[PDB]
């Protein structure tokens, strides 16, 4: 990993999205099933409404003694915290450690392109290539 | 950052731990509290005998509907995948990828002395010194 290098070559398009109706008990199942520490949450127009990571599901719902059947709506975070896609890694990180966030959506044009996640950094520390091209 | 180095050059130590009385909500109102990610069970004796972290309260609690009250006792891990304090940064991270957790606790001759977690690896990852 190069911290001088775009953010765009270590993010991920990994990017789930549940409506604003589904259930918290649902979306961590979601969130299980597919490895991810976060969800955004998307309106019938196909736009993004909402944010929320596992962290938040502690702090809104578990600590509060709530229902485990509310709807994220009512724990979802209504603006996101992003970095360009040409943002350098270094300076990402940087904007993770103020922010004390251990995801970050990407940005390019004004439209979320994807997500950068710790569990990217980990797979850039271990030198991991994603390949565009057929392997056999 | 160095892959070489120990591994306590990049650990913390702000370990927090939990009696296995304590209730899922407790835990989960300390975590918040104490602005940590995961925490571990001690026994009487001061000795650790589990670990369990947010992912995990989400994973055994909320999608088996289990109430947020009981006992961390139930929902804690008891098989700690551990990496000692002079084991140098590029095992650790072979180790966490391997078991794929985001947690691993550290251990100085058997006994928890701290943890190292991807929120760890991105501040060394900033860090601008060495240690030799």
């Known amino acids: 990993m190069d911290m001088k290098a775009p953010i765009k070559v270590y993010m991920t398009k990994k990017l789930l999205g549940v409506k604003p109706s589904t259930s918290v008990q649902e979306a961590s199942r979601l969130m299980m099933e597919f490895d991810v520490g976060s969800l ?6 196909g736009n993004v409404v909402g944010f929320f990571t596992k962290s938040d599901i502690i702090r809104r719902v578990i600590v509060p003694g709530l229902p485990y059947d509310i709807p994220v709506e009512r724990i979802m975070t209504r603006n996101l915290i992003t970095a360009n896609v040409n943002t350098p890694l270094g300076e990402v990180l940087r904007k993770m450690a103020e922010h004390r966030i251990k995801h970050i959506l990407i940005e390019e044009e004004g439209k979320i392109v994807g997500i950068f996640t710790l569990s990217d950094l980990l797979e850039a520390s271990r030198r991991r290539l994603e ?3 057929s392997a056999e």
């Open 131 to 133: 390949t565009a091209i």
């Open 40 to 45: 955004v949450v998307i309106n019938d127009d």
